[PDB]
């Protein structure tokens, strides 16, 4: 699915 990068 679409993603918007890591968040830790």
């Amino acid at each position: 699915a679409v993603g918007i990068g890591a968040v830790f």
Partner: antibody
Amino acid sequence: QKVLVQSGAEVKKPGASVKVSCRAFGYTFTGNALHWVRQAPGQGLEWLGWINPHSGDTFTSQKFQGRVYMTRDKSINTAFLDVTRLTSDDTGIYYCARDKYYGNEAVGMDVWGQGTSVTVSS
Amino acid sequence: DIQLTQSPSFLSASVGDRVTITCRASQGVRNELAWYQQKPGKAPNLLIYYASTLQSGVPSRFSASGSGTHFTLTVSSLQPEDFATYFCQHMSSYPLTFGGGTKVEIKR
């Protein structure tokens, strides 16, 4: 105890801008992507874009690129939606909504703000 | 934009009825699909994600099926609090889009 609290109702003239705020409580704000979705009266749901609150990266829906801007301020756990060059077709209720964000991908919108009414009219 | 076509758009039913709502995607979206309930004056509430996983806090009378393009949401026995509008949503590409909604109203 997860809650998103949005700013109050706005009324604007065509061509003006509006900045809606959305503050996260009860979870780590920077741990989940945040969507913005609007609903005109009597109509369906329209996705505006989403933001990574940790990094500030965004994807804005193509029809709003260059007009709608998503930002955040981690110091106050708050995301902002700036909708510029307003027209009456921007009238509606604007929501922020958290994604479950498992695996750093979109899964589903599990916490929603209460909505912010935006009226645009001459 | 992927189009999600829901059917029926309007449904009348009684408490205790089984309700089946369909969502058809114009392109394959794997299981990257969610379902929501919305009542007047309120934000939507998440019911189902990953096409068929039930969200915590949602009664077990809600269930869903589908992988690819043809998805269904079922309420096995409608309760008074289930009369509402239901939406599907994909997240396989941008923009995310929602179906047009199915409004379930009470028969009398």
